[PDB]
Amino acid sequence: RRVLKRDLKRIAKASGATILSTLANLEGEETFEAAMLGQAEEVVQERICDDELILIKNTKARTSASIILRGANDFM
Amino acid sequence: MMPTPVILLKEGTDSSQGIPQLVSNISACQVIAEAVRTTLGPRGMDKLIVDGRGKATISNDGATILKLLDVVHPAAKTLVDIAKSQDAEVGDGTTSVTLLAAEFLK
Amino acid sequence: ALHVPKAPGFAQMLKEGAKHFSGLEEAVYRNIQACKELAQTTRTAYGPNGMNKMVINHLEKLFVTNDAATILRELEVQHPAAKMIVMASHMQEQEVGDGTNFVLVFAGALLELAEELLRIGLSVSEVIEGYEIACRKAHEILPNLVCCSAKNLRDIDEVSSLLRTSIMSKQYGNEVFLAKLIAQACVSIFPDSGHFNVDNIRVCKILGSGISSSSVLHGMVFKKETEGDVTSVKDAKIAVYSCPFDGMITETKGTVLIKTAEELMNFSKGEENLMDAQVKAIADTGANVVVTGGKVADMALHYANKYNIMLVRLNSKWDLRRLCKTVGATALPRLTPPVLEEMGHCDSVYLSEVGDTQVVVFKHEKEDGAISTIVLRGSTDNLMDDIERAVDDGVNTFKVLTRDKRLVPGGGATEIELAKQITSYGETCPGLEQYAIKKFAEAFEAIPRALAENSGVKANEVISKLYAVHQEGNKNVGLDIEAEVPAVKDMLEAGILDTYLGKYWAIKLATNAAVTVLRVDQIIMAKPAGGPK
Amino acid sequence: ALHVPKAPGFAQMLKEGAKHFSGLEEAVYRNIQACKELAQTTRTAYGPN
Amino acid sequence: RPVLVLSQNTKRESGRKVQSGNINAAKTIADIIRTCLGPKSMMKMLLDPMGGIVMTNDGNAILREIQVQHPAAKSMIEISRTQDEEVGDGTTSVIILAGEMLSVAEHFLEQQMHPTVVISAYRKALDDMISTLKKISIPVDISDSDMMLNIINSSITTKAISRWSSLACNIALDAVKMVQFEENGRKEIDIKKYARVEKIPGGIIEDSCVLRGVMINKDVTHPRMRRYIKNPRIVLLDSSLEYKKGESQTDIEITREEDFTRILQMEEEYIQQLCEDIIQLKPDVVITEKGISDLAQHYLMRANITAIRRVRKTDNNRIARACGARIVSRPEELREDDVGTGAGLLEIKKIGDEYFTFITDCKDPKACTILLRGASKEILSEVERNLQDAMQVCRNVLLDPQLVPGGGASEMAVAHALTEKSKAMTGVEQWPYRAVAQALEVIPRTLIQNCGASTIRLLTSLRAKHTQENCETWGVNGETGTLVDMKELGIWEPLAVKLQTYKTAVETAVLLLRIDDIVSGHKKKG
Amino acid sequence: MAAVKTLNPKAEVARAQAALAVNISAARGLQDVLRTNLGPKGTMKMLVSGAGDIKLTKDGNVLLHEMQIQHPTASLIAKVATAQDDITGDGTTSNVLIIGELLKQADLYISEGLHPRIITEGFEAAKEKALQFLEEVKVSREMDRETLIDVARTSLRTKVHAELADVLTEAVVDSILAIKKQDEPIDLFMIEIMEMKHKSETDTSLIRGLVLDHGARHPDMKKRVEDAYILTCNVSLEYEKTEVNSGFFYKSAEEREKLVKAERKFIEDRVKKIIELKRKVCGDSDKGFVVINQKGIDPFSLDALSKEGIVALRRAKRRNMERLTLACGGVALNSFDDLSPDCLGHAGLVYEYTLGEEKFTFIEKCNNPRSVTLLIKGPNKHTLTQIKDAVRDGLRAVKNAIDDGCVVPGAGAVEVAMAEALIKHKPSVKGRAQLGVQAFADALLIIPKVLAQNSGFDLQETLVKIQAEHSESGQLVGVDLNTGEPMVAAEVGVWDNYCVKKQLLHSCTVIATNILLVDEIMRAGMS
Amino acid sequence: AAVKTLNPKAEVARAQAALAVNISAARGLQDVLRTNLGPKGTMKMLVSGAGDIKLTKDGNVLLHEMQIQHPTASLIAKVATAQDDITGDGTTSNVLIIGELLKQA
Ligand SMILES: Nc1ncnc2c1ncn2[C@@H]1O[C@H](COP(=O)(O)OP(=O)(O)O)[C@@H](O)[C@H]1O
Ligand SMILES: Nc1ncnc2c1ncn2[C@@H]1O[C@H](COP(=O)(O)OP(=O)(O)O)[C@@H](O)[C@H]1O
Ligand SMILES: Nc1ncnc2c1ncn2[C@@H]1O[C@H](COP(=O)(O)OP(=O)(O)O)[C@@H](O)[C@H]1O
Ligand SMILES: Nc1ncnc2c1ncn2[C@@H]1O[C@H](COP(=O)(O)OP(=O)(O)O)[C@@H](O)[C@H]1O
Ligand SMILES: [Mg+2]
Ligand SMILES: [Mg+2]
Ligand SMILES: [Mg+2]
Ligand SMILES: [Mg+2]
Ligand SMILES: [Mg+2]
């Protein structure tokens, strides 16, 4: 929950998923179809120095990248 | 008066006892009486009292004059109280009560 | 070499405004001095010749009286030991009702003599043990000092004679009249059941006509007026309601939902008809006086005026309960007509003016009732307040007499007899406690000494005469007030008697307070800071 | 538990404006630091250059 | 009206003064806690601004309780916090090492060497330090409980809990072992969330134990419920068991006289329906994070069920892990699998003047609580800190089974290795290399100084010993102040802790060596 | 000056011997103040708050809390004493004295250049030996009423006046024996402590029942019911507003009256359920109902109940539900859905006492109450507070004695024997820790010293008499506070709780060891 | 106290407080002057208000050049001054022996 909008957009673009602000098709019904789903080879929650973050590893339909910078303190 | 490390009553408490305080009470009653003395009888006069707001009042009535005076002396307030009592029970003689009481004390 | 530093340890760790007194001189002697000072302040108001004191509290209110408990209450006492003695006096007032000045004087004398004993060489423990032994001896002796018993509490004359002494210390000059008033009021109350309720005696203060014009009314008086037009009923049929005299409404939320013109046109008329029906149903039971604890609606008042019903609105629920007790009605919670059991009855309810205040009077012709009231007149508010204090003292004395009928001679006779017997007992007792026992006995002299000083005679001559007379064997002899020379007279025949229970409780409480003060060895006072209340 | 009092003894007897430095870190190292600073201030004027 | 190119409150400092000030600030931060290292360390009293007292010898706590103005000191404090968070030990070591490297760097900065050269030499040195540390490590058989206990002991010999060594070691080892958990092919320990430490002042420290379950400061809602259930079936919840307002605005309109009573009866019926849905699973204990209605309590007692309300979410998660239950929010969707079977005893008992709820006989619990009984709150806080250090060390060893000799043996071995390597560079940066290599000797030197032995003689002897071939495990005895082989004394350290300490110290030196300007006083401009 | 002051100029620091001096001075000050509390002969202290409230006390923990002190070491010692009071309920003054004497004895050697670490090692060795000796010397015994009376006396005599202690001993022992279930932990919450402010101090007593500080709110309810059924309920009998914002809509006055009459049906149903139960249970006027309700009752329901001769109490305390179910023997009800005569409690007498503007209800003459009340009576508020504290200490002491069958001789005998055993064991300790062992023994010797000093006798002469008698006889001889001669504390009946002594040893040693190892005090959290 | 009643602005230390104050001052002087005794003593730097520098380990000079305002310190300083005036040596030992006598007492 509370995923940042830019992060969600990047994840959807990389994984092939589609942002869905609502569940409402053009028939007036409320449905969610499997074609609207992104895919990835692994999703984990790793531990990075007493904290945790979610890694979406090896997304399909597009390659993305992120960098985790390890230093000595916040200023570094 | 040796200053006790912890005083008995609250600081600033004023106590007066003995003959001098009773004499002072009699003098205060005299002072209250003389403020209504001239308003007695067919040749009596009127008093004009202006409050803080500037709204003046004119009266020949002893009870009214005494009420309009901001009397704070504890012994003097008894004369105002008996003037009010005479006004309530009878309605006339509110000057005679104060004059008689102060004359007894004197 | 110009400053003495604070001693290392606790003295340095003490807070910025805190104080710490330890040892004999710093703590015990200071406490004794403070208690002695308080006793001196209250001493001059003791006995029939006691003098009123005009005390002005922090709220600019004026108190004039010689009641010791009231004076101590209105004084802003700060020293904690004197605070403890004041608590003892207030406890004596609450338990009995008279003897607060005795408690204060006895405690002061005991603490003074305790300081003397400590100075001559005794320890605190020995003094405390001696006082405890002497208090036990005094409590053993006291039942043997009873001279007579009340032996009747339904008699006006006997009760008045018994109560005269209690209300002679206050209002010395005119005590027979007040004694008769309080005796009549108390005899009206106190039914065949032995229980007597102090709150059943009410006091109404109406200013103007001098206290000699006061009277006792078998009923109640309320300083208010009638809501309606009817102002006098001679065969009252009071119906009391604790609810407002108005059509009852919902409790969550009520809104009048109108959907047609007819409902809008008929709503107010129907509501008025309903109120009229309720009021007429109330009136058809014969009720002609209605007392409500809440507001009175205009339609209800109009319909009550139509049916000739007297309306009285009591603001306080305490007054409502007292009226229900004194009339015999049950405070209904709705506007239902009262059943014959719940309907109250009274001989006469009417509106009258006393002085310049309009009052409503619920008067019983019978010499009976649950609640009786005393109408106090006077020329000053403070004078009526002091007379009310005297009335309270007399009522408490009557209550004590109901609890215990034993009486002991007054005017210092009991104190002198106690002192003589305790001195005799302490001589036979060996050890270091004999000094404390003798000092406890000598502390009883402060009562006849205070009486003699206030009466304007030499206390020493009075005390010597009292010891002589008690030495021949007259144990019912006290000092004579109406004499310019030190003289004594019999108190049993003079009727100057005070309750045994009051003496017992006062002695116990004063001894406990003095011992408790003596037990303290260190005082750690925090910073006073604020604390307005 | 909000203030640290002065230790009993010489610490309390010291005058209000006086200062007392004792031990290696408090005295010797401070003196060496001051001397080093003074030498640094004068250093750049040494020699023909 | 001055021109004021910059703001009035802006101050600029530059040049050698800035570098000297930064290095002196780091040295001061090091000197604050220099004496709090080693088995013979002395504790310090920290006065909290809020009025509390922190009495400890842990480096991170001491540095965290100190407010400083110089930004270099702030950097050092952040370094201490980073070391504490990453591995949980070596805080004093990393602070002292950073101070020493910054001192030996100031030595060169005073001469005409540019800081970039010193930084490059430091980075090369750090690489060789890591290589040598990995080289001189030894493996560990995690199955052997005795070796794990010895490692935890070596971790806690320098803390106030060292008096009760075996007890603390067993507590930490058991807590870590039964908080270890694996799911979906992912392994975790999570000392932070589970393995709670609960401290109850009073009693004796020997009575401290880790429970095979959890303990909370809670009591039954109604006294009629049982306070001792043998083999309870626990059901956990989040939603309140009481009637609540809806999300939308739902005003009613009553015109018939019987609708008010009807509505109240429907409220009661809703409560009864919820309670019946809960009872359908036949549980014995019901735990809720929110309130439980009194009528709900009656309906539950009718079915002989113990109910506890207003439990914290963290406590409820710990209970779920301990007793194998799953928290549910809608009782109508409660399933059999969600019922917690596995707790072997539930008991509410009074400790001191307060009730505590025990679920303390779980079979295979994945969460636990540690009950600390001690003299006071400060003693128990220090004990909790020491036990946290022990658990962190145990987790580090479990993740990385490599060990490194302690007592300064590793420092001297790495210093000798780097000194030998420096003989071949023959460049200009060999001198900073050798200086930062020998800066590692501050750890044995500090151990000797705290022990009270002669520093120069012992360090000379230690260096001479390390110049031999097989002497990498020779260090300083912290008590007797003598040179002993650490395979005989038995003091060993996890390789992760040493690596993190070395890396963080070197990187702090690099970061502070890089600065030469300071500007301050400007507005936040948020 | 120091590093901290260099980084933070507005910081206060004490280093090296300064820290030891500061801590030892604070401990010595606290010990010097609390010396006079120890023993039944100790002096009574008087405490005045900022608002002017007067408190007479002798308890160590109470005195520590009301100290006007802001010292860090004082705060640490106060926390330790607070924990000691919380768990064992006794030994706070002994705690402070032993900590202070430990620190003083340790300083006596540290000032001679000795390192504190050696002293702490000696301390822990001596503590181990002392715990072993205490295990050896305890007196395991099944405790009948006499032993509990002796323990309660040994506590209350130290807390209050001798006669008040004599009364309170019977009170507390009888209460504990009343609420004590066989081989079950004692629940001290089941003994209500109620204060009344009218009689003398010795009038306090034990009621085999319950006392409530509130009475019936309806003047028509009976003031005294001889034979009573008790209904303990947690059901609100007053008007309740609907949770979902009902509101009433009507079009006429008659409709409004109908709605008003029909808005109380829900509560009237429960009231009529209670009435039906009362009429079924008792068809005569002999018995009666007392309805104790935790939640309020509106005047309509009060009137409806009073019309049927039922006395009802509202807004009872939460603990009173368990207390009444344990005393009267009923079942606490959270709803009246299924109420039967079997859920009703019983009480042989219920009456109301009026004291000023407060009502007190007495529920006594129960069959076999498992929860009783201790009515504290006195003429002053401070007297009531002092008696309440003394009663808490006595209850804790008796419960501690019941918990473990052992009990330790008092009057300082155990400390004297422990010191002698430690002196004998001292040669077995290797190294310079013998100095710490000697310091620990001398610190333990403080209790007989302070007892003899408070009794007025000479300190050193009395102590050497006691020690010589113990050495020559081997008995556990304490300090006779009347004559100063050695006295066998076991035979006289001066008993101390074994758990209290063990807690004293452990906590005092731990805190002294931790303080001695402190070498710096910092206050640098500002700015 | 009794004295403070007559003179409100009076400082008094009475009973054990006087002993505590005197012994604390003596112990402070002893703690300062311990390091002077013997040839292995430590140099002390004495900087005056005007900035004058004095280096000494003499007991009397050090006593006169510390900034102390204590009565017991003044008495001990007078004793040491007399010792120096007549014999010229033993001031440090004088202070040490006085302090140790008070401590042992
Ligand atoms: N007519 C009298 N003659 C002599 N003594 C009297 C007389 N009337 C009252 N007393 C004494 O006055 C005392 C009462 O004093 P009082 O002012 O009432 O103090 P308190 O209210 O504390 O009792 C009693 O001890 C009584 O003996
Ligand atoms: N018995 C011992 N003998 C010698 N050195 C030891 C001993 N136990 C621990 N040490 C050393 O003391 C250091 C631990 O100090 P510590 O207070 O834990 O600092 P930190 O908390 O920063 O790790 C380790 O480097 C270790 O090598
Ligand atoms: N009658 C007595 N005779 C001799 N010694 C006693 C007597 N009563 C108590 N003591 C001793 O005095 C001590 C009382 O300590 P106390 O004042 O209660 O300190 P605390 O409140 O900290 O427990 C106990 O250790 C006990 O051994
Ligand atoms: N070479 C030495 N070896 C051993 N002891 C010495 C030597 N020289 C002096 N002392 C001792 O040291 C003390 C020096 O005291 P000193 O510093 O002179 O104090 P003061 O100046 O007050 O006399 C003397 O008491 C002397 O006995
Ligand atoms: Mg006229
Ligand atoms: Mg009287
Ligand atoms: Mg460590
Ligand atoms: Mg005790
Ligand atoms: Mg010399």
Residue C99's region, left for phi above 0, alpha for psi from -120 to 50, else beta, is left
F57 DSSP β-pair partners? F45
Among G5, G7, G12, G14, the residue to mutate for chain B (most B Cβ within 10 A): G5
Q: Which amino acid is at F12?
A: E
- The secondary structure of residue E333, as a DSSP letter, is G
Q: Report the number of secondary-structure helices (H) and strands (E) in chain D.
A: 2, 0
Please list, in sequence order, all residues whose beta carbon lies within 8 angstroms of the beta carbon of residue C291, skipping any fewer than 6 positions away.
C238, C239, C240, C241, C312, C313, C314, C320, C323, C329
| Residue E185 CA from chain centroid, whole number | 25
Residue C173 CA to residue C101 CA, distance in Å, equals 20
- Name the one residue in this structure whose structure tokens are 């842990």: E58
In C56-121, which ranges are continuous DSSP H helix? Answer: 68-74, 80-95, 100-120
**In chain F, what is the straight-line distance between the N-terminal and C-terminal CA atoms, in Å?**
18
Q: Tokens for F372, please give them.
A: 């009783």
List the determination method. Answer: cryo-EM
* Integer angstrom CA distances of residue D29 from D33, D36, E442, E452, G45: 6, 10, 18, 20, 14
Which residue, among E208, E513, E156, E134, has the nearest Cα to E380 in the 3D structure? E208
Q: Which helix (H) or strand (E) holds F372?
A: strand F372-377
Among C510, C447, C499, CA closest to C91:
C510
Query: What is the rounded CA–CA span in Å between residue E521 and residue E4?
Result: 14
CA atoms within 13 A on the CB side of F316: 29
Q: Does D11 sit within 8 Å of F12, measured CB to CB?
A: no
Q: Put residue F178 in one of left, alpha, beta given phi > 0 → left and psi -120 to 50 → alpha.
A: alpha
Judge whether F159 is annotated as a binding position: yes
**Which one of E158, E386, E389 would you pick to mutate in the ligand 2 pocket, going by the greatest count of ligand atoms within 8 A of its CB?**
E158
Q: Clarify whether E400 is annotated catalytic.
A: no
Q: Is B95 annotated as a binding residue?
A: yes
Neighbors of chain A with 3 or more C-beta pairs under 8 Å: E
Tokens of residue E13, six digits: 């400092």
- Alpha helices, DSSP H only, in E329-429? 377-399, 409-422
In 3D space, the residue among F383, F411, F387, F400 whose CA is nearest the CA of residue F41 turns out to be F411
What gap in Å lies between CA B16 and CA B24, rounded to an integer?
A: 10
Residue E453 has a CB neighbour count (10 Å cut-off) of 15
Degrees, nearest 5: CA angle G38-G41-G42 = 165
Intra-chain end-to-end CA distance of chain A, in Å: 30
Least Cα distance to F13 among F524, F525, F527, F526 occurs for F524
* Half-sphere exposure at residue E169, Cβ-oriented, CA atoms within 13 angstroms: 18
Contact list, G9 vs chain C (CB under 8 Å): none
Chains A and C in direct contact, meaning 3 or more beta-carbon pairs closer than 8 angstroms: no
User: Which of C335, C375, C365, C352 lies closest to C235, judged by CA?
Assistant: C365
Query: How buried is residue F527: exposed, middle or buried, by Cβ count under 10 Å (0-12/13-18/19+)?
Result: exposed
Helix (H) or strand (E) run with residue B65 in it:
helix B62-68
Cβ within 8 Å, pair B4-G5: yes
- H, E, C per residue of C223-250: CCCCCCCCCEECCCCCEEECCCECCCCC
Starting at the edge strand found earlier in the chain, the sheet holding E53-56 runs: E53-56, E43-47, F518-523, F12-15
Residues of C in contact with B85 (CB under 8 A): 207-208, 378-380
Question: For ligand 2, is residue E494 a contact (CB within 6 Å)?
Answer: no
- Asked if G28 reaches chain D (Cβ–Cβ under 8 Å), the answer is yes
Q: Are F127 and F509 in contact (CB under 8 A)?
A: yes
Phi, psi for C529 (deg, rounded to 5): 55, -120
Using CA atoms, how far apart are residues F315 and A56, in angstroms rounded to an integer?
58
Q: Which of E410, E491, E493, E501 to mutate to test the pocket of ligand 2 (most atoms within 8 A of CB)?
A: E491
Quick check: G1 contacting C, CB < 8 Å? Answer: yes
At G87, give phi and psi (nearest 5°): -100, -30
Written as six digits, the tokens of E492 are: 């060993």
Q: Is E345 helix (H, G, I), strand (E, B) or coil?
A: coil
Which residues in chain A have their CB less than 8 angstroms from residue E511's CB? 72-73, 75-76
Q: How many Å apart are CA E378 and CA E375, to the nearest integer?
A: 8
Q: At what angle do helices C124-141 and C433-442 cross, to 10 degrees?
A: 50
Find the DSSP H helices in F296-432: 299-306, 318-327, 381-403, 413-425
Question: Is E192's CB within 8 Å of A50's CB?
Answer: yes
Q: Which two tokens stand for residue C70?
A: 């009231």
Residue type at F232 in one-letter notation: T
DSSP secondary structure code for residue G23 in this structure: H
**Is F393 part of the annotated catalytic residue set?**
yes
Measured in whole angstroms, the distance separating CA C72 from the mean position of its chain's CA atoms is 14
Does C481 contact ligand 1 (Cβ within 6 A)? yes
- A75–E192: do the CB atoms touch at under 8 Å? no
Q: Decide whether any atom of ligand 1 lies within 6 Å of the C165 Cβ.
A: yes
C260 close contact with D: CB closer than 8 A:
no
The answer to whether the CB of C98 is under 6 A from ligand 1 is yes
List all residues 6 or more positions away from C521 whose beta carbon is below 8 Å from its beta carbon: C22, C23, C27, C28, C124, F36, F43, F44, F45, F46
- The alpha carbon of residue F248 is apart from the nearest alpha carbon of chain E, in Å, by 5
Tokens of E84: 């504490």
F89 in a known ligand binding site: no
Question: Which of D6, D12, D13, D32 to mutate: most G Cβ within 10 Å?
Answer: D13
Please tell me the distance from the alpha carbon of residue E109 to that of residue E116, in angstroms, as a whole number: 10
Q: What is the dihedral of CA F162, F168, F174, F180, to 10 degrees?
A: -110
**Nearest-atom index, ligand 3, CA of F479:** 4
Which residue of E31, E47, E51 is in closest CB contact with D4? Answer: E47
Where is chain D broken, named by the residue before each break, C–N > 2.5 Å? none
Residues of A in contact with E81 (CB under 8 A): 73
- Indicate if F373 belongs to the active site: no
What spacing in Å lies between the alpha carbon of E477 and ligand 2's midpoint? 10
Which residues partner with F296 through β-bridges? none
Of the residues C44, C169, C445, which should be mutated to test ligand 1's pocket, given the most ligand atoms within 8 Å of the CB? C169
Q: Whose CA is nearest to atom 4 of ligand 1?
A: C411
Pairing of strands C357-363, C310-313: unpaired
Q: How far is residue F288's CA from residue F387's CA, in Å, rounded to a whole number? A: 36
Q: In whole angstroms, give the CA distance from residue A68 to residue A61.
A: 23
**Closest chain D residue to F5, measured at CA:** D26
Residues in chain D: 49
Q: Which among E28, E45, E377 is the nearest to F3, CB-wise?
A: E28
Q: Is C99 annotated as a binding residue?
A: yes
Across the interface, whether the CB atoms of E511 and A47 are under 8 A apart is answered: no
CA of F156 to the centre of ligand 8 (A): 8
Q: Indicate which residue's Cα is closest to atom 20 of ligand 1.
A: C99
Give the binding-site residues of ligand 4, using a 6 Å CB cut-off: G 36-39, 59, 89-93
CA dihedral C520, C524, C530, C531 (to 10 degrees): -40
Shortest-distance Cα residue to atom 2 of ligand 4: G39
Q: E43-47 and F518-523 as β-strands: parallel, antiparallel, unpaired? A: parallel
- Binding site listing of E: 38, 89-93, 158-159, 407, 478-479, 493, 498
B90 → chain C, closest CA residue: C355
Interface contact A72-E192, CB threshold 8 A? no
What are the beta bridge partners of residue E507?
none
Residue B4 near chain G (CB below 8 Å): yes
Positive or negative: CA dihedral F430, F433, F435, F439 = negative
Breaks (C-N over 2.5 A) in chain C follow: none
Annotated binding site of G: 38, 89-93
Tokens of E162: 């060292």
CA C225 to chain centre: 30
Q: Is F92 a catalytic residue?
A: yes
E47 touches chain D (CB under 8 A): yes
Chains with ≥3 CB–CB distances under 8 Å to E = A, D, F
Rounded distance from Cα C139 to ligand 1 centre (Å): 20
Mutation target for E interface from A42, A50, A73: give the one with most E CBs within 10 A: A73
- Neighbouring-strand partners of residue F49: none
Q: Token match 């500002």: residue?
A: F526
Tell me the HSE value of F396 on the side-chain side, using a 13 A CA sphere: 23
- Given the residues E84, E284, E315, E389, the one annotated as active site: E389
Residues paired with residue C63 on neighbouring β-strands, in sequence order: C55
Q: DSSP for F455-514?
A: HTS-HHHHHHHHHHHHHHH-S-EEE-TTT-SEEEHHHHT-EE-HHHHHHHHHHHHHHHHH
In angstroms, the CA F311 to CA F318 distance is: 20
Distance CA E513, CA E98 (A): 11
